[PDB]
C-alpha cells in the first residue's frame, strides 16, 4: 500500500508548525571536499506545498540586493533544527506577491 510505504520508508522529522508568512532559519548539512558543515538559511516562508512525506516549503531571503529563494522538502536527511523567529499574520495560503515586492514597508505584519 502507498500509505504503508510512505510512513515506513521515509524517516519523519520533528519540526515545529509553520506556514505562510513565518520567518524561519533552516540549518542544513552542506557537503564539501570530504568535510561536511552546517549552514543556515534565514528567510520568510512563502508557501508550503504537499500532502505527506513528499511536501516541500519555499523560503526567500535577500542576500544584499539580490533575492534568493530555496525549496526544501520537509523530510530531507540534511535538515536539522529549524528555528522560528516571527509568526504568520497573513491572509493567504501562498504569499506569492512577496516575491515581486521589496522595500522597508513590505517586510511582514506582526501577529497578535
Amino acid at each position: 500500500l502507498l500509505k504503508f510505504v510512505q510512513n515506513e520508508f521515509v524517516a519523519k522529522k520533528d519540526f515545529p508548525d509553520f506556514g505562510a508568512g513565518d520567518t524561519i532559519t533552516v540549518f542544513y548539512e552542506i557537503k564539501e571536499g570530504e568535510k561536511t558543515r552546517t549552514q543556515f538559511f534565514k528567510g520568510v516562508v512563502i508557501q508550503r506545498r504537499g500532502s505527506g512525506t513528499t511536501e516541500t516549503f519555499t523560503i526567500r531571503k535577500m542576500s544584499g540586493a539580490i533575492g534568493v529563494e530555496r525549496i526544501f522538502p520537509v523530510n530531507l536527511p540534511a535538515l536539522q533544527k529549524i528555528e522560528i523567529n516571527k509568526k504568520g499574520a497573513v491572509r493567504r495560503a501562498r504569499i506569492f506577491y512577496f516575491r515581486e515586492l521589496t522595500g522597508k514597508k513590505a517586510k511582514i505584519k506582526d501577529k497578535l
Binding site: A65, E69, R70, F72
Partner: protein
C-alpha cells in the same frame, strides 16, 4: 534557461553591466544554459572607466538564473536575475571581485577561482 538573444547582467568588477548572449557552448543545437554552463557573449554597456570595450566578444559562465534549478538531493535554487561572469581566453576568470551570491553548482565544475571570492555560495 538562457539562450541566444538573451540579455544578462555581468556580476564582477571587470567593467561591464549588461551583456547579450550569442551562443550556448556544449554541443549541436543546445537549447539553454543553466548555472555553470559556458556561453559566448558580447558586451553592451562598458562602464566609463572600465576594462572592457563595448562591442567585444568574450566567453562567460552563467552564475545566477531566474529559473528554478534542481539538485540531486531534491532541493531547488531560484535567484531573481540572470547573471554571468566573464572568463579569460583559457579556463580562468578575469577580475578579482564578484557581486552578489553564486550557485553551489558552480563548484562541481572546478570554478574554484570564481567560488572562492563571492559573498555567498
Amino acid at each position: 534557461m538562457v539562450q541566444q538573444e538573451s540579455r544578462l547582467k555581468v556580476a564582477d568588477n571587470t567593467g561591464a553591466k549588461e551583456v547579450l548572449t550569442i551562443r550556448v557552448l556544449g554541443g549541436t543545437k543546445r537549447r539553454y544554459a543553466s548555472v555553470g554552463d559556458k556561453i559566448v557573449v558580447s558586451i553592451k554597456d562598458a562602464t566609463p572607466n572600465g576594462n572592457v570595450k563595448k562591442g567585444a566578444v568574450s566567453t562567460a559562465v552563467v552564475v545566477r538564473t531566474k529559473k528554478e534549478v534542481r539538485r540531486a538531493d531534491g532541493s531547488y535554487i531560484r535567484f531573481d536575475d540572470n547573471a554571468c561572469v566573464l572568463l579569460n581566453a583559457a579556463g580562468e576568470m578575469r577580475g578579482t571581485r564578484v557581486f552578489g551570491p553564486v550557485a553551489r553548482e558552480l563548484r562541481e565544475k572546478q570554478f574554484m577561482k570564481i567560488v572562492s571570492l563571492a559573498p555567498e555560495v
